[PDB]
């Protein structure tokens, strides 16, 4: 009831970074602080480094064990966004606010960082443990999947949108709303294949279903609290991101047909303000008046 | 934004749901209270202005030094005695923006219209204060227009030379090519529009000294010409314009037809180089049969009858090309290569089509040569012979190449002052004067076919115009038929101005004894049929004055018959594309495309309704896409039965139709006797 | 060398189905015979399911085995186009010529037909035979790969190229160019990372692996005269098909890094018209000797 | 596949470690005894063969009607008496697939090598039997060979034009733009490459006339010359191949480098069009001091001066340009204009280098003209005089432009006969008959410059074959002995012949009153310095030849003085590419690139080894990237300094060196006298 409206609004959507002029955030990169800078830059790098994998691996082995024509089309589209837009939007930005040596350091920064090492260990794990002909593992990967579209991504988001909410850096911001229009729908798509899943299952199946969903969702969090206070302490705003991560985590769940997890709170208003002619043949009557 | 910009786009707010068509006359005012006059070197008296534009080298010494002082200071009073009022904005501004002199660094406006019109007025008139004042009266009544050329050069310095409009034979040699982009590149110099007929070319994989396989065809003579149109653009100015006619029969006529299609790669498609293609009866009755066409190598029939393909009939010639062993050719199907045409001119407007029976049958110069092909502006059609180009220190055999003079009537101005024969043959005598005054030193040929055929191309505008302001629909038979009686009394007197100069002169053109006109073939139609109007409205329209009957047909053929005819070719309905605003005209005798229209000047929006537009006559003012395209052809064709040359008419097609329609109108004008077609505008 | 290259070309090439209309390819498909109507409906079944099979299987196993992260995007940039773009064209095209019914009658036909089995079947038999880590696989996979996008396509294409260079069928003609020029770039870029692979090569091995795709060329080659025969003899055009595939036989060589393997022979007309040194700054002195 | 080619592939096949180049000959006797004499056609007699080739158009009558049948059988007679046999298969190859005459259909072989060394003997001879079987020894031993223009086309009625390379200077008028296209497209048709001088040509943003910024520069006449170029390409077998030159102090040197950058658009890259460059030593001078160079307008300094930016010295008036106001300049950077031209060799090998002041300091007709630009092959450096091409029926002054005709001497051949004086004045000869026998009928200032120059080129081949032959190493100091002492020698018998021709005549070449032969300063340093050689080796290889020596060149001299000279230029020494083949001789003076060359013909590959390539001198036969290009331009110096006209000096670079070393290099041979560097061909 809803692959053609999907594959209808992802190709409608496609975009390239390069549309995008990146010069005129030269100045208010120019203006931030060195604490600033950092974060901003591995903050992005932390996004590649996800659709990186979202690409080469989430999306296609999906693909793979998802059944139908069109359901497989929308995923490769998907596939195609992460790597082939997404991931290398963030170059382009990288390509323009910063020297070489500063992008070559952020790239090394990301294999050694442990919370990022082991979101993407995790995530992955699980992208390769899908068994043919198996839905248990398919719906297992898909909520991972949900959890990296939904939720994992706006640790790295909130900054982004923080400064374009300001009206700082608002180029690269609007990079950052296109990569984010697209994810939004990429979790909704995914969630509706994963529930799909768990609706043939038994209530005790679901209940451990449910238990997977929460326990991973939990391990994730964990590790994402470490990983936000390690890029935000030194900016000031490690608070207000796990706010808007649990926001998303939230979000995420629904997405999956779950209730709600956490608690609503205030969301810094700043990130809010931050979202050829038809041819006939010559007849003989033609010719004759 | 300026106040006349304003008072120009207020025309569009409507107001008690109309559109306020007069603010357009208020805004004339403020272009002349605000700009014009601020920007205009007055002088003290005349004579200071013509000195310092005479020293300046803004001007001729040669024409102005041919009247005493008091008899410029009376033309020039005469021409501002009318007090002329531009009544739309856009005619002004087209004028001052184009045609007004102005000084070296373009800041300061050194002529009005007054003054332009009296200098090329008096250009003219050569020597003659009555005659140059008879043509300040004309110019300032807006009842005749000297085509952009001359209208904008006349009587200046720095100039192009006053003929645009050059059509060049190309034999079938390297020697020939090579002259003829050299032609072509001294004639866009001049500022002129150049058409060059390939037909004569051998196509590709022909023959050069008995080595086969050897010749790149016409696609590779059109790559040339293009890259010299390219380069000749006017000093950087305009976009150099060139034509480039084939005959269908050709071999190449589909690779040329692929030079404009779009996904022709680089080394195919011509950019700045218009396409025609002339199209013989025999094609269009193997069409019409839906037998399968041939297309021929012309080097081989050129060694097997000595002649080229386009120098004979094809009517007559074609089974005997099929028939020949001799002759090589590639078989064709005549309506897939008529869907292709339908198909580039829906893409692209081209080619232009040139019906070659529809020209030839009324041409009355057929023994100095079949019309083979037309202008880049598909309206000029005459008879050229090619010309050998030889090697160096060798003598060349120069040819005729056509370069017609154009000037247009204001058919409103024309008929509301009731003064068609004056008008008509003051239009003839100015340019007469522009031929003979015409002296092109780089191309020998069309020198030649200047001295000697003395053709010029008199036109006609503001046909829609008129019959819009006088409550007549462009597609009514009523307007049929006065288009039938109008151009029948501008052709009887343009005829009778002709052979009057060709009797004071004591000369006609060369060749003409062979003509129609001498045998009095010409008049034959004119002797039989009377062209008087059928409906009693156009009979009230042609009040207070004289309408040519058989009688005065026949007595004009006498005349000529005496006396002989001075122009081989006397009129050309041209285009015109920019004297119609300043003329505050409709162009040509097309109908106009929108009834107002939006155009874009710096960054600054502007609008211009149609002359005459309002209320009353907002339903008459048809746009040209509404109407039924065999309407308009049929008009055309009236009108093309009193012109000797062709008419510039473009299709005014709507994206709904398709190619059938398009071949359709196309085979629709070959019926009706159409010449040429110029474009397929498609909305 | 060339992936960012290629990258470029790929994505500056996007279209999407719904640009071109149809209907009006229904003013000439009336005035087809029934035998160009037949071979027509065949010809194009035929590209649709071997174009299927290399969106579902052959781009994205090849994008799986490659390592590299902007090889990986430029490979799910083209699996993308094959499942997004020309499978929905190609149904577009059918949906538009032939009432359901005869659509599903064709396919019917084709999917048993044996010249069309075999070589499909022989594709997809060296894509389910690349092994992890086997980079001697994976090139044979490219090879087949290559053999299907630059010459296995054509004695398909032919016929569309075939109408479309006489003015019939204008707007499935252009669909049909616009996924060949799709075909043409896919087989040139997987053919560069086959020569990646051959180059890694001891001679022995390239000289076993050159007969390999000698072989392999061979089998595909017999196989397509008799398809050719099977589809063409009917309206005549079986002579000229035959030069057709042999000449893109030889550009798909070349597209490896091979010699071309038949004498070069001239086309069909209508078919015809259907298709750094390192800069080092003077140093002074060096103007003195 | 052939017999011949597994046998010539069996060389690669190593035996014991080593090259089997024996098998090359092999594959010869196989060549001959599979394919050459199967496809051979035999008459019964020599008479039944010249009357079938003379009336099936293979053979123009003329030149062998000047003998009886009895001379030319004798003259056939004395060519297959040597019994010459190709050491070779790619020589005998190469001979019967280029320039062995085939029937029409070209299925059978009518011509041998001894017939066509006979004919081309028989052309030279003009009825001198004894001069024919001269030249006949003369090419059948290979000592000298004329180039593949007359080798292939002497006494051919199917034949082009003899001469290799013509130049024509292009004046700055659309008239002479015109011309110089037709003639380039002339030229091309007759198979020569054309090199034009646009440095005359004003630069973009020019006036034509008083209209500012209207000229396109020299790369709009670029793109038509590239188009006309590619239009006449030789009836579609050989591209059309032409070169543009152009003062690097010209404005739009930047543009016309930009021509050939890989990033250029389509509406600025120009891709049949070789580029050169050419350098005064003001500019080397200026990049030298590192001080900020200025570009100049050429038509604002005609207008001040009379004269052309390139008709006079640059060292001398660069200032008085710099400071005059009325000139307009634009200033650049001379380094990076240097450092462009080094990446834009690198990248494609373009543009060539002319450095001017090494040209004309020992040019010995500057009073004629300077050299401004060079051929397409970078090795014509001759006086050349502007044509002013009028508009027509206006009379046009015919200047000069350079046309020579090539011979090459092969230095093995000829040092291994001892016969350097008896070679030297038969090429002298046979270069005078095909310079007479020249008559060109669409480019008059060649016309003018080949019967008033009679300038020739003998050039010489296999000097790097010679060296390694001879145990020499080609960067070693006594191969520069010994092309000193070859190039001095070959100098002189020519300057000799020359004279001598002129005795006999009793005419020299115009102007030569005024140049450094009539006034002894060309003698200079050959009355003065001795060049005999300085090594004992080289001594013994020039044993049995008298080595002039200073009293020698005096004498020499006075004979000049006394008779003056027949030819204006003699010595130029071009690349000599495929007709190196078949005289079994490395190409020109040049290094060889490779010791065994692989190139693939048909579906097959064929290596070709060097002449003479074996286990004893595969170390002398050095590759040419792989030497220090240093040394190879002290070998082109060394050449240099004995030939008046430039010599085809290609680079071989390696990929891992920078820009830097390409300037470098150029520097050097700017320093050490270079004339031209032709190209930049890295590894
Ligand atoms: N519509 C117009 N077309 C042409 N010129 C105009 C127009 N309106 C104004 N001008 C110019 O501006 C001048 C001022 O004209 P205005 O309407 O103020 O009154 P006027 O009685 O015609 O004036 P004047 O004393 O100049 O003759 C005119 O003489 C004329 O030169
Ligand atoms: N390398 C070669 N170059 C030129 N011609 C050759 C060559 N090899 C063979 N031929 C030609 O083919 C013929 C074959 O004869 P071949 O050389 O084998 O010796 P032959 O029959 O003993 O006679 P001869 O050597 O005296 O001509 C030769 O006479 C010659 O015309
Ligand atoms: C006509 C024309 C000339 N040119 C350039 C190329 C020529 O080298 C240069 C000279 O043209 P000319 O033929 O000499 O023009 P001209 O003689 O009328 O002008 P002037 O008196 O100043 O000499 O102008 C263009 O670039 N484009 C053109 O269309
Ligand atoms: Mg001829
Ligand atoms: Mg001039
Ligand atoms: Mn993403
Ligand atoms: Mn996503
Ligand atoms: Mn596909
Ligand atoms: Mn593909």
Redesign the pocket.
């Known amino acids: 009831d809803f692959t053609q409206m999907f594959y209808n609004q992802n190709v409608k959507q496609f975009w390239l970074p390069e549309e995008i002029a990146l010069n005129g955030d030269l100045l208010t990169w120019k203006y931030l602080g060195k604490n600033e800078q950092d974060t901003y830059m591995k903050v992005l790098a932390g996004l590649t480094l996800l659709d990186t994998e979202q690409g080469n691996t989430g999306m296609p082995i999906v693909a793979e064990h998802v059944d139908g024509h069109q359901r497989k089309a929308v995923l490769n589209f998907m596939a195609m966004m992460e790597n082939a837009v997404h991931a290398k939007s963030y170059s382009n930005i990288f390509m323009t606010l910063a020297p070489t040596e500063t992008i070559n350091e952020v790239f090394e920064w990301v294999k050694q960082n442990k919370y990022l090492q082991k979101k993407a260990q995790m995530i992955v794990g699980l992208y390769k443990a899908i068994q043919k002909d198996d839905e248990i593992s398919l719906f297992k990967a898909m909520v991972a999947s949900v959890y990296l579209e939904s939720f994992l991504f706006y640790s790295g988001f909130y900054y982004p949108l923080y400064f374009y909410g300001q009206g700082k850096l608002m180029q690269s911001g609007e990079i950052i709303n296109l990569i984010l229009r697209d994810e939004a729908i990429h979790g909704v798509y995914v969630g509706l294949l994963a529930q799909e899943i768990y609706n043939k299952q038994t209530e005790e199946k679901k209940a451990e279903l449910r238990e997977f969903a929460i326990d991973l969702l939990n391990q994730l969090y964990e590790n994402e609290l470490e990983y936000t206070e390690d890029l935000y302490d030194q900016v000031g705003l490690s608070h207000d991101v796990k706010k808007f991560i649990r926001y998303n985590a939230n979000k995420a769940l629904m997405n999956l047909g779950f209730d709600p997890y956490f608690e609503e709170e205030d969301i810094n208003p700043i990130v809010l303000n931050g979202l050829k002619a038809t041819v006939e043949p010559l007849k003989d009557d033609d010719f004759y008046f | 934004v300026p106040k006349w910009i304003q008072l120009n786009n207020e025309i569009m707010i409507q107001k008690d749901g109309k559109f306020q068509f007069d603010k357009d006359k208020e805004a004339?005012?403020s272009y002349?209270?605000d700009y014009?006059?601020q920007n205009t070197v007055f002088f003290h008296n005349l004579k200071e202005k013509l000195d310092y534009l005479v020293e300046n080298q803004y001007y001729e010494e040669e024409f102005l030094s041919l009247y005493s002082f008091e008899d410029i200071k009376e033309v020039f009073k005469t021409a501002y005695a009318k007090?002329?009022?531009?009544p739309s904005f856009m005619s002004?501004f087209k004028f001052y923006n184009d045609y007004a002199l102005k000084t070296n660094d373009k800041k300061k406006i050194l002529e009005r219209y007054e003054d332009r019109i009296s200098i090329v007025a008096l250009f003219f008139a050569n020597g003659d204060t009555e005659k140059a004042k008879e043509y300040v009266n004309l110019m300032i009544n807006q009842e005749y227009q000297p085509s952009t050329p001359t209208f904008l050069n006349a009587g200046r310095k720095r100039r192009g030379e006053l003929v645009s409009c050059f059509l060049l034979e190309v034999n079938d040699s390297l020697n020939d090519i090579s002259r003829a982009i050299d032609i072509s590149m001294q004639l866009s110099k001049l500022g002129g529009g150049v058409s060059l007929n390939l037909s004569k070319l051998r196509a590709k994989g022909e023959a050069i000294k008995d080595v086969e396989n050897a010749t790149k065809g016409v696609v590779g003579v059109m790559k040339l010409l293009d890259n010299a149109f390219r380069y000749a653009d006017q000093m950087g100015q305009r976009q150099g314009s060139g034509a480039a006619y084939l005959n269908i029969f050709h071999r190449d006529i589909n690779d040329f037809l692929d030079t404009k299609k779009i996904s022709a790669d680089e080394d195919v498609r011509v950019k700045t180089l218009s396409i025609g293609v002339v199209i013989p009866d025999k094609f269009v009755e193997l069409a019409r049969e839906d037998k399968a066409a041939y297309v021929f190598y012309p080097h081989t029939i050129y060694k097997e009858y000595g002649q080229h393909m386009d120098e004979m009939d094809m009517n007559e010639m074609y089974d005997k090309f099929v028939d020949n062993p001799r002759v090589k050719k590639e078989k064709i199907n005549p309506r897939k290569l008529l869907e292709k045409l339908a198909m580039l001119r829906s893409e692209s407007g081209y080619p232009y089509i040139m019906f070659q029976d529809n020209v030839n049958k009324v041409h009355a110069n057929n023994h100095i040569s079949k019309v083979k092909f037309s202008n880049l502006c598909s309206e000029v059609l005459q008879a050229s012979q090619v010309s050998s180009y030889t090697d160096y220190d060798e003598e060349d055999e120069i040819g005729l190449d056509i370069s017609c003079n154009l000037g247009s009537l204001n058919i409103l101005n024309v008929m509301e002052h009731k003064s068609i024969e004056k008008t008509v043959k003051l239009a003839t005598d100015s340019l007469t004067h522009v031929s003979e005054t015409t002296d092109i030193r780089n191309a020998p040929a069309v020198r030649r076919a200047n001295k000697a055929m003395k053709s010029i191309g008199l036109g006609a505008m503001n046909l829609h115009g008129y019959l819009a302001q006088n409550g007549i629909a462009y597609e009514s038979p009523e307007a049929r038929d006065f288009a039938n009686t109008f151009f029948m009394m501008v052709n009887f007197y343009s005829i009778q101005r002709s052979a009057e100069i060709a009797k004071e002169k004591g000369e006609t053109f060369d060749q003409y004894e062979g003509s129609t006109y001498a045998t009095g073939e010409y008049f034959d139609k004119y002797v039989s049929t009377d062209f008087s109007p059928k409906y009693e409205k156009i009979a009230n329209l042609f009040e207070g004055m004289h309408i040519p009957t058989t009688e005065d047909w026949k007595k004009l053929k006498a005349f000529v018959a005496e006396h002989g005819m001075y122009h081989s070719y006397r009129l050309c309905i041209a285009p015109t594309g920019s004297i119609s605003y300043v003329q505050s005209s409709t162009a040509s005798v097309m109908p106009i495309m929108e009834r107002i229209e939006e155009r874009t000047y710096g960054n600054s929006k502007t609008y211009y309704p149609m002359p005459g537009l309002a209320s009353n006559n907002w339903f008459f003012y048809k746009e040209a896409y509404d109407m039924d395209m065999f309407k308009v052809v049929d008009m055309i064709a009236t009108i093309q039965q009193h012109i000797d040359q062709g008419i510039s008419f473009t299709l005014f097609l709507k994206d709904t139709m398709t190619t059938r329609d398009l071949n359709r109108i196309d085979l629709y004008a070959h019926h009706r006797g159409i010449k040429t077609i110029y474009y397929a505008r498609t909305k």
Chains 1, 3 share one sequence.
């Open positions: 004339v005012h002349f209270v014009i006059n007090k002329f009022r531009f002004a």
